[PDB]
Design an enzyme around this catalytic site. Structure first.
Site, PDB file in Angstrom:
ATOM      1  N   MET A 390       0.841  -1.142   0.075  1.00  0.00           N
ATOM      2  CA  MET A 390      -0.015   0.003  -0.021  1.00  0.00           C
ATOM      3  C   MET A 390       0.930   1.311   0.042  1.00  0.00           C
ATOM      4  O   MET A 390       0.374   2.315  -0.546  1.00  0.00           O
ATOM      5  CB  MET A 390      -0.901  -0.055   0.934  1.00  0.00           C
ATOM      6  CG  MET A 390      -2.022   0.978   0.851  1.00  0.00           C
ATOM      7  SD  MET A 390      -3.538   1.055   1.586  1.00  0.00           S
ATOM      8  CE  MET A 390      -4.373   2.529   1.085  1.00  0.00           C
ATOM      9  N   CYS A 447       1.206  -6.432  12.243  1.00  0.00           N
ATOM     10  CA  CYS A 447       0.099  -6.750  13.401  1.00  0.00           C
ATOM     11  C   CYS A 447       0.526  -5.427  14.575  1.00  0.00           C
ATOM     12  O   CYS A 447       0.962  -5.761  15.551  1.00  0.00           O
ATOM     13  CB  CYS A 447       0.575  -7.892  14.258  1.00  0.00           C
ATOM     14  SG  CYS A 447      -0.487  -8.457  15.531  1.00  0.00           S
TER      15      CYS A 447
END
Ligand code: ZN
Ligand code: ZN
Length: 818
Positions: A390, A447
């Site tokens: 991204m 995470c």
């Protein structure tokens, strides 16, 4: 009321086996599953498959019980399905009268159309020591054993045979000892003339090594000049010993060979650093070059850690480089070393001799600049055809290094929804990968927002279901790749009471994947950096589940706690080399001693190496064929003040901010920094030897923070003494790397006062460069990055070091054979 059924299947001397038995007028058959009630009313019901039925001469009517493992007694714990059982290698003989009931156990086999998808039952074999869930054995009963066939027993049996020392070939007995030509242990065959790995303490070298001349430890410290000096109140093992086998002899017990007493007599090999050259003489030698020697050592076979190939340079059919990169554990020598005259000479004569893999189509999610994909590429097992990143600079970086890959700079959630919807293309014309395209799925899902250890509740458990870790698994579920790799920070396994780890293993199992997890240390695969990563491996039903790679380099023990505790149970990986290893550690020196000098703030992204490779590691990263360009040897431009602090950190190992002098300094601006003033007491730290105060704020006495105390533009950062007490005196801040040490985890933005601040070069007055950081990871010098300096640092610190990734890749490479 227990009576047999049908005529006996087979007779032994003490046992007669049967195919059917009647327990309370109810048929029970070999192959049926059964429950037994625990004495401890709190334990889960015992469950077993009946593998055999037989009668003893003494009237005991028996069956053999191959136990199942309930889900909650594996890593899954309370997250696993109540009705799911797992196979395990635990069985024992029990008397029929203990059985409580018949149970139905269904083998939920993977469908023949498994790739296109997405009464107790079972699907996997559970290995409780390594936390591996694996496809059940394919082994079938033969007519000969069809009556006693026990999957558990055979696995324990096959293991015993592999583990145990056994002598394959005897020569002659001589003076109460049988000499042998060939032996074996743990699946490896050792012959005369083969070489062996040994613990550092297996034997000693005859060279004399004098304990250093030592040195005083400085002189007295002026504490007015150094008001913070007061706060200052190699550990990697040695690599294996190597020896060529000369003789093999064992004793005898009760007139037969005593295999617990096999001994090997060896020719000692010298590593360069074992001769008198030591370390100062081997900075430049190959990590696998050795020296022949005629010194002999006696060793216990039990101590042999593995087998390695050692060849005389001149007898080689290939090039030293080609031979070396050809296989693992390959060494060479070209000279002998006379331990007595400290001279090197030619080797004696008796020291002399006598399917292209398809590449898996790979999708790399959260690819970054491609460190992980680069490692797989190096192993020759994959072709990253699709990458998703991204963040644009990194996405561009990926394109630079992988011209062939479709890089989707986009949110992974909307992309998956697009393919699930049957769409062939995103809005930019880029062809989306479809079911069947993807054979290997790997990635490092950030995470975030799970760190620390509070419980999980109603609110936390749901964001997990909406996290990028779930997105990655959703990818696994749709594409059903042959192999699945999830990389992350070490604490993935411990986040939220290990519940993130447990939910991700539970998820892979629900889909029918074989899977395991483990922790690896990048330093042990040929990089000078501490970087523990969690790794989840998964394999489709039809595949082999990979092993974790055996450490290649010795590394600092404190950085190699690879074990994981989940609900008080200790899990380890299959890794067996728990201390030493084949190769010496890669140091900061090996990493960047060839790089030209640059100044704080240097910005020329292309400069020539002004001198050849010095380290084995630098020869690897720069290549064998041509390139003149040193790319990205640039570093951040620090404040005049921060630059001055850097010129003032001494070059001795361990130097940091507490070594700074309390002096006025002319800054690069042409300004003068004033002296930090100590005007408060420290009841905890006291007065100094010069009778000076040591507090820089009122909270030091200890009251509350004073409105004006705060001091600006000082060589000694005002804040570091302010809060020193709370943070172990901030050891490491503005600290220099050691030539003999290694990088702390390579960071996204190198700052002396940052989270991780041992970022100053060992000699130059600057932070480490983008190239040096890329070298601290395992990046080749040809690997391209993109954007401003802060963009490039970020790409480098985020990557998985290709040498770690490659290591993982070769283990997967093994699973495409066998
Ligand atoms: Zn058994
Ligand atoms: Zn204060």
């Amino acid at each position: 009321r227990i009576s047999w059924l049908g005529q006996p299947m087979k007779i032994e001397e003490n046992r007669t086996y049967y195919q059917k038995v009647s327990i309370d007028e109810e048929m029970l058959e070999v192959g049926d599953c059964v429950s037994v009630i625990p004495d401890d009313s709190s334990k889960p019901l015992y469950l077993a498959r009946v593998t055999a039925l037989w009668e003893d001469k003494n009237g005991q009517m028996m069956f053999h019980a191959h136990w199942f493992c309930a889900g909650t007694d594996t890593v899954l714990g309370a997250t696993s399905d109540p009705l799911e059982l797992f196979l395990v290698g635990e069985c024992e003989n029990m008397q029929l009268s203990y059985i409580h009931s018949k149970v139905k156990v269904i083998y939920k086999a993977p469908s023949e159309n498994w790739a296109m998808e997405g009464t107790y039952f079972f699907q996997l074999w559970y290995n409780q020591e390594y936390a591996r869930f694996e496809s059940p054995p394919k082994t079938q009963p033969t007519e000969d054993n069809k009556h006693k066939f026990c999957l558990s027993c055979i696995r324990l049996a096959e293991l015993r045979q592999k583990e145990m020392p056994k002598v394959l070939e005897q020569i002659e007995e001589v003076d109460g000892r049988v000499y042998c030509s060939s032996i074996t242990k743990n699946g490896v065959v050792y012959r005369l003339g083969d070489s062996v790995y040994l613990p550092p303490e297996a034997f000693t070298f005859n060279i004399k090594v004098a304990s250093p001349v030592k040195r005083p430890k400085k002189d007295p410290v002026n504490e007015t000049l150094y008001p913070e000096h007061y706060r200052k109140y190699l550990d990697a093992p040695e690599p294996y010993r190597i020896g060529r086998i000369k003789e093999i002899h064992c004793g005898k017990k009760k007139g037969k060979v005593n295999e617990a007493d096999i001994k090997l007599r060896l020719y000692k090999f010298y590593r360069p650093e074992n001769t008198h050259r030591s370390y100062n003489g081997s900075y430049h030698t190959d990590i696998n070059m050795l020296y022949w020697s005629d010194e002999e050592a006696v060793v216990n076979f039990s101590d042999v850690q593995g087998r390695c190939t050692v060849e005389y340079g001149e007898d080689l059919l290939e090039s030293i480089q080609d031979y070396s990169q050809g296989g693992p554990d390959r060494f060479y020598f070209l000279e002998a070393y006379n331990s007595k005259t400290k001279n090197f000479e030619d080797p004696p004569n008796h020291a002399r001799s006598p399917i292209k893999l398809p590449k898996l189509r790979t999708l790399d999610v959260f690819s970054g600049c491609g460190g992980l994909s680069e490692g797989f590429h190096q192993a020759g097992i994959s072709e990253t055809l699709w990458a998703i990143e991204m963040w644009d600079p990194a996405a561009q970086a990926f394109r630079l290094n992988n011209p062939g890959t479709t890089v989707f700079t986009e949110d992974c959630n909307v992309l998956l929804k697009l393919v699930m919807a049957g769409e062939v293309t995103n809005s930019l014309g880029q062809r989306l990968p479809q079911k069947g395209d993807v054979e290997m799925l790997c990635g490092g899902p950030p995470c975030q927002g799970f760190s620390g250890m509070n419980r999980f509740n109603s609110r936390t458990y749901s964001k997990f279901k909406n996290s990028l870790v779930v997105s990655f698994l959703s990818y696994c579920d749709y594409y059903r790749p042959r192999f699945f790799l999830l990389e992350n920070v070490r604490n993935f396994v411990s986040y939220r009471d290990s519940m993130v780890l447990k939910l991700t293993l539970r998820c892979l199992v629900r889909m029918g994947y074989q899977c395991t997890f483990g922790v690896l240390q990048a330093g042990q695969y040929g990089v000078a950096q501490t970087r523990r990563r969690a790794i989840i491996l998964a394999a489709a039903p039809g595949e082999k589940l990979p092993l974790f790679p055996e450490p290649l380099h010795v590394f600092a023990p404190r950085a190699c706690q690879l074990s994981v505790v989940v609900d008080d149970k200790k899990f380890v990986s299959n890794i067996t080399r728990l201390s030493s290893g084949p190769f010496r550690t890669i140091t900061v020196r090996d990493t960047m001693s060839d790089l030209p000098e640059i100044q704080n703030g240097a910005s020329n992204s292309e400069i020539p190496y002004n001198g050849e490779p010095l380290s084995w590691f630098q020869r690897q990263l720069r290549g064998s064929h041509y390139q003149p360009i040193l790319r990205d040897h640039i570093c951040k431009d620090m404040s005049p003040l921060v630059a001055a602090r850097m010129r003032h950190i001494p070059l001795f190992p361990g130097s940091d901010w507490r070594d700074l002098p309390n002096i006025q300094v002319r800054l690069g601006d042409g300004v003068i920094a004033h002296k930090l003033q100590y005007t408060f007491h420290d009841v905890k730290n006291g007065y100094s030897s010069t009778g000076a105060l040591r507090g820089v704020c009122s909270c030091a006495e200890g009251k509350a923070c004073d409105p004006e105390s705060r001091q600006f533009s000082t060589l000694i950062p005002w804040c570091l003494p302010h809060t020193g007490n709370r943070h172990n005196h901030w050891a490491g801040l503005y600290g220099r790397l050691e030539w003999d040490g290694f990088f702390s985890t390579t960071v996204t933005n190198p700052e002396p006062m940052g989270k991780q601040g041992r970022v100053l070069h060992p000699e130059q007055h600057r932070v480490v460069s983008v190239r040096e950081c890329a070298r601290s990871q395992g990046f080749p010098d040809s690997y391209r990055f993109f954007g401003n300096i802060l963009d490039r640092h970020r790409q480098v610190g985020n990557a998985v070091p290709p040498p770690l990734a490659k290591a993982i890749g070769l283990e997967i490479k093994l699973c495409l054979l066998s």
